[PDB]
Amino acid sequence: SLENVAFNVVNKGHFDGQQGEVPVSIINNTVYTKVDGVDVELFENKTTLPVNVAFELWAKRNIKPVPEVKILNNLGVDIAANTVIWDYKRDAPAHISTIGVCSMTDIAKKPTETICAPLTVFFDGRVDGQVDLFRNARNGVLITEGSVKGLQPSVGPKQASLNGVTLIGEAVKTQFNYYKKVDGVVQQLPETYFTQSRNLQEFKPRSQMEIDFLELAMDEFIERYKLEGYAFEAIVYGDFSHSQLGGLHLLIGLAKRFKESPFELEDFIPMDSTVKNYFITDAQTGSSKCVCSVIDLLLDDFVEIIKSQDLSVVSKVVKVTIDYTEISFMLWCKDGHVETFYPKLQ
Amino acid sequence: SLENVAFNVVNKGHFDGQQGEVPVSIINNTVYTKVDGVDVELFENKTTLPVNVAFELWAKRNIKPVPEVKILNNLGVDIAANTVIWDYKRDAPAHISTIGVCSMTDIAKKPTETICAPLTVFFDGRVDGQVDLFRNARNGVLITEGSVKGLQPSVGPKQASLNGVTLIGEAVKTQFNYYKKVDGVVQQLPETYFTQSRNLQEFKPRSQMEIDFLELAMDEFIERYKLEGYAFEAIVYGDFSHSQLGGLHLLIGLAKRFKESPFELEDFIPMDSTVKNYFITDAQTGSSKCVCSVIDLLLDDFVEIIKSQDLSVVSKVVKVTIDYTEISFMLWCKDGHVETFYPKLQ
Amino acid sequence: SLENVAFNVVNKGHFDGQQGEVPVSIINNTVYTKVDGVDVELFENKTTLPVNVAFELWAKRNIKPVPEVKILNNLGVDIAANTVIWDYKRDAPAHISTIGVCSMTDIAKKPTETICAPLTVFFDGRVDGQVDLFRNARNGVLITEGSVKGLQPSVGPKQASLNGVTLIGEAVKTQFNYYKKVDGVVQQLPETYFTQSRNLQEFKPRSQMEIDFLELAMDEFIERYKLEGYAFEAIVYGDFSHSQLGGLHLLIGLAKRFKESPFELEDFIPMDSTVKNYFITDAQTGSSKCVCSVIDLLLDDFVEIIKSQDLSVVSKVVKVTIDYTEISFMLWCKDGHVETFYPKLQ
Amino acid sequence: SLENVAFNVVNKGHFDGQQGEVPVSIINNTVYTKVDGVDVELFENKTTLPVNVAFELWAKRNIKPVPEVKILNNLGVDIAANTVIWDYKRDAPAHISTIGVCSMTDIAKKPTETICAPLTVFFDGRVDGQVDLFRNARNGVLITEGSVKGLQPSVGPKQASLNGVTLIGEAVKTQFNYYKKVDGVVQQLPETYFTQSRNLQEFKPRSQMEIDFLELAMDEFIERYKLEGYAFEAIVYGDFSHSQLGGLHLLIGLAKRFKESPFELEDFIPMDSTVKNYFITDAQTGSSKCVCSVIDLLLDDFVEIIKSQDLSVVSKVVKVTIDYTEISFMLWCKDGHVETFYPKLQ
Amino acid sequence: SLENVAFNVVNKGHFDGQQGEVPVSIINNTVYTKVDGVDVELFENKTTLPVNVAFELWAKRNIKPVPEVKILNNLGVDIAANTVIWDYKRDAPAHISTIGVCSMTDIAKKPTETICAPLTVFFDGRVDGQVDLFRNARNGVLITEGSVKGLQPSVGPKQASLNGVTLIGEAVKTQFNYYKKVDGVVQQLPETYFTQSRNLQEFKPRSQMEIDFLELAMDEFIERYKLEGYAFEAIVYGDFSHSQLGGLHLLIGLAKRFKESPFELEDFIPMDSTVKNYFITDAQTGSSKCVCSVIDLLLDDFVEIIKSQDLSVVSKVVKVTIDYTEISFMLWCKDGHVETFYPKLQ
């Protein structure tokens, strides 16, 4: 019930299944509740769904640490089992349909129904009975905080999403084991690098090499870590000398530049992806690139990736498994050294 | 509950207090329900209220014969006791607030609370206990289908409103006895004429004089009923010879003209009133008046009113009690005969 | 393209696949085009879809005679193959998804894809290759204007829908042969009666018994056709003597009453169904029923149905196959004669 | 002022320049006023303009007989001098800009400013000083009810538009003399036929030939008026024997067909033009044409036009001056008789 | 007038009663004005009121230092006398109705009318004649910057709200004397603590103990101020070791934590109250509580409150008068020391 959902929201901050109702008014894609005679905004609908439907899905969103939406997208997750994964990047539910959550968006009450068999259902082992549900599911992705009998685990990212806050858990567990079934057969998830899901204005180094990159100058870091011939001056640090911005394809380089000269990042596709494209405008020099592909990889991981390449090729597409998906990089080299390395197709 | 209100609407045509819910989507000031996977419109909000609030008030509207909104307005009714009077002219609730109906519009649960004491509460004797509630109310209007002990009744209009259909009841009782209390004192409602609440395109004569007016020509009807010197040719039949339309202040004359030449009536204040103002454009001659005051009185009643006037005055304002309210008419006369008679202030 | 769709609409009345564009402005769920410098409304979105999506689906609607939406719903049709069935009752597409029509609503380009296998796809034999597509479809409904090799046909209703106009075709063929496949197996469609899809204000008799019903009085028609003991006075003609309206469950009886006394029909679920529920208010007597189940059966067909019943039962649920679906009727009888016969569950 | 405009609307039906204000609430592209504590709708914005701007322009619309919008469009009128021409077909102002009417839409206060020199300003001689303004205007169209010194008049249509009602005036003058200036030079308006601006459901014959067409059968009318060899059976009466509707390009033929069999006319470009295109669906036969060009010419005028053609040509484009604009007709003939005659380019 | 209100807004920043008008366009719940031919946004309606009504109320808001909305709510203020109190937390007027401000929201022109007698009217002594109006008011709250003859004052908070900025005035007076009348009798306002209305990201200590709390560690501050046995480690500093966040019920503790580790505060009821509830998510540890009751009391005041309690009780509800209202705290103790102290009912 709309009024019951609003009662739960005003009294517990989210839907907890408590009984009770409050007066609700809907207007301008917004849900208001009346507190002491004055209307108070509870929810502004930013989705393509009806306002009441979006309000109910947002109230019933998972408030426990959940995998980032990019991870679920790369795993082909189409729907979640008896929960709502809220996409905080889009301010919308991460999946079109639900299973036993909202009457307007449900396609089934339980993930065992025939409509969910072709779909890759997301299962959370922390909920009782979902491991068995995944065991009997034709297609599904399972996350657990521990081991599963007879199933080889895939270690996921250290970080997870908690109410829209991406963090590495200390008081809560955010590292999950990932399991995937396709057509009833348990798959072996590929060995992968993971993006760190960091922010430009709140960048924090997670390794010694990243610390050195942030504090040391360009030449000192390049010489210290034996990174001559890999075009780190352009790929990571970025070139701001021409009207068209060069390189700057790692979030750590953008953060280092932002520390000295705050610039502009236009996120013209505001969603959660392994590779993010930005319309970057440098506020100090005026160098700008309309499509700048940025990936937030650990600098140690990116150094390993670039050093594992074969430099004796002019043009070559590099396939790297990042966040359980294959990211294709363009590798331009000359005279046995790198001239360019960015995610292709920007 | 919104969903429960919609369940009642889809299963019973209105709110009947039945338990159950249906999937509901709200968009574009419209309430949709999902029937077999496709959204079906249940209600389009034409009010100034929030869409869900208006939907709930419309579902809980009185489906029994109720007094016309103009009658309640003339009696000073500000609010109804535990019911919603729906104004079908405005497609909106007839009163801003409610008593024990909708959480968003309620000012009280029962009419006995202190907030309802200054307000003139509408009481329906057909509902059990409302006669006693009116007896203890400081201000109120009571309607009954029978007598009330110790209270002198006022006979109201023969017709009432049934789901937006104004009719004189045959299988149901539409004539009510009216009682009014002001500051705890029972008032004597004035003797009044009543408008017939008829429509232009569905006009039906309710008296022999009206039949004669509709069939007989102007001169024959005027001579037959001894109506010489009262300007019936202009006041009732209307003058379509000049660019500015003359007279035509009785609905029966407009209906007679519409039978021969269908014309235009712009209702620029679409509400329920004893006197209606129209922007009339005659489609045959081009005569038009931007403000034409029309009252739907019984022709026999209007003849009595015009013949009860004193013709030996040049200009005089005539006060007639119509629908429990005082309607002021302008009476222009010359040489002991009427030149004009219309509701004043148009 | 939105602009190309609008170009086709302004130049051909619907989408015909012609190249060209016109200036388009979208506002207030409405599509406007500019003709000679002034904006002209092309489409008002009454659906739950985005305005541009609904505009494109409406432009690409089938303009050939198509089965009524109620027939497709009773056959379990979930989606149409490479066409849009427009539901003119709801002013919306009859199906949520499309196959190769609109990028925003498509789930597949051709009905042969895996996503369409569980769905009952609607196939039109008048389109080249759709008979073969239906032959290879797991679930589907096929309509043809002629015979299909090896497939036993089911004769459908005489009438079809042509641009929202239900008619029995003379210059065009509106009677179709119906074929159904469930899980790859051709089904035998049950022998059924068909509703006539007539309107109250435009009722036309399609049989001699209907003509007699319309012209003859109650007693004369009942005695002429040997209809004593089947409660035709209540079930068909209707009882307007009490406050609660009695019977009136056939559209022909409502039309006969409307001819003498125009009344009110509130269609509180405005969709296309075999059985329609109305909030009926009789304008002459005041008799009203909030839920009146009305079915537009041929009077000869209804007489056969009521005479095929076993009168020696007090209460019995009658299952009649109407419009390829099972309609359940309540049959109350006493002393070997009918007291009541209406669609159950109103 | 918005509130002053609403005061004028509620007290006079339109803007009359009276002082005073009323409480106004704007919501959902609708202007509401509060009468006795309840909001009453004054105006629903159907234009592309802001709701308050459209409300002000609608209140200040010309309430005197004005030329039909199609006539002003054919004369190239871009703007009106100190008045608003309301297009009742579109429920919008006929011109984008105004001169001294509304602050949001004004481009000038008087038509003498430099911005109005390239524009063809509409002048009304019935307003004092507008004849002199037109005399000094570079581009303009003048209408008068009488003669103008030194200017040769062009006799316009007998009918005009009065508050959205097209009529031939009896108590008011609706026939105007038309004058046009282009680049400061008085033009000679071409001799033209005029459309009658009649409606399908309210068709009234304006000539003896039209009366005969309506009452007499096809063969009798064709033989009586010597109309053999001009394909009147198809062009005017229409062919309903095939799936594609044939002919029916005169409003009188559509009205004659509508008298016997009411059909469907989808006006997919709802504006005012000399030639109207309809998506016609015949409800009796099923014959339908998505683009049917219909012109409402006097039948005597159309007979003269078709008889003034040279029948000894296979294909020929006929240019007819109708409503001060050149309408191009396609004329297909064989063996010295007409096979087809419709407005070209439908 | 809407246009006059907009003129005042564009020329003075708010309504000052100046004459003049500017072109105004209303669309999408937004008021635009035209400056040099381009529309400029003046106001975005975030209220439940009509856009023009909300715009007028916002323009006429009090721009002088006014009591915080929480204070007026705790005093039972229902309406303000001839002024608008704008609630900047909700971006809406603090009261539903007005007295002599806006025609659409006024219930009276002066606070002396009968409709305002049951309501607690807010009076501002800084406006001439409002002290006398409060003297004759049945129910009211009066604020003055000085003494009132014969009335015992209540010293209010040091801070007030100035155009949405809460500050302790230096060039202006923000400390008011408060007076309350209920049913015509002057009340004695209870002795109370006052919240400091500080922000998390702009926290500034207002006492020496607060400075020590911010700079000193947990153990040093607890030992210095003799705060052993009152569970300051949990109640104020907060526990971030478990998945469920513990304590953290004082804004100073949240600010201290935010200084070291910026976290998330979801204000799911965005209004002004003495006790605020937040959905807190700690970005460093992952500890989160969906309902965290936070009160911004002076740390010296909270120490006095917690030390004035009787520790020899297991469970006890503590009633503290804060901001002229009774705040109920839960006090759990064991072995003569505090285990928990938070506002109850979160």
Author numbering:
A (entry chain E), B (entry chain C), C (entry chain B), D (entry chain A), E (entry chain F): 1 to 346
Source paper text:
Remarkable stealth activities exhibited by coronaviruses are facilitated by a series of non-structural proteins (Nsps), such as Nsp15, which is a uridine-specific endoribonuclease that mediates evasion of host detection of viral double-stranded RNA (dsRNA). Nsp15 limits the abundance and length of poly(U) within the negative strand RNA 5ʹ-extension by trimming down the initially synthesized poly(U) lead sequence to the optimal length that can suppress dsRNA formation but still serves as a template for poly(A) tail of the positive strand genome of the coronaviruses. Nsp15 C-terminal domain (CTD) belongs to a family of endoribonuclease with two conserved catalytic histidine residues (H234 and H249), which serve as general acid and general base, respectively, to attack the 3ʹ-phosphate of the target uridine. Cryogenic electron microscopy (cryoEM) revealed Nsp15 hexamer structures at 2.3–3.3 Å resolution at various functional states, including RNA-free and two dsRNA-bound states.
SARS-CoV-2 Nsp8, a previously hypothesized cofactor of the Nsp15, was also added to facilitate the Nsp15-RNA interaction. CryoEM imaging shows that an equimolar ratio of Nsp15:RNA resulted in mostly apo-Nsp15 (and data set 1 in Fig. S2) and that an excess amount of RNA with the Nsp15:RNA ratio of 1:10 yielded a complex with the available RNA binding sites within the functional oligomer of Nsp15 occupied by RNA (data sets 2 and 3 in Fig. S2). Multiclass ab initio 3D reconstruction showed that 37% of the particles belong to RNA-free apo-Nsp15, and 39% belong to Nsp15 in complex with obvious dsRNA. The apo-Nsp15 was reconstructed as a homohexamer with D3 symmetry and refined to 2.3 Å resolution. The hexamer forms a barrel-like architecture with a central channel, which consists of a head-to-head stack of two trimers (defined as top and bottom). Comparison of subunit A structures in its RNA-bound form and its apo-form showed an r.m.s.d. of 0.388 Å, indicating that the binding of RNA does not induce significant global conformational changes to Nsp15 protomer. Superimposition of the apo-Nsp15 and RNA-bound subunit A structures showed that the C-terminal end glutamine residue clashes with the flipped uracil base. In the RNA-bound structure, the 344KLQ346 patch swung away from the active site pocket, allowing the substrate uracil base to fit into the pocket.
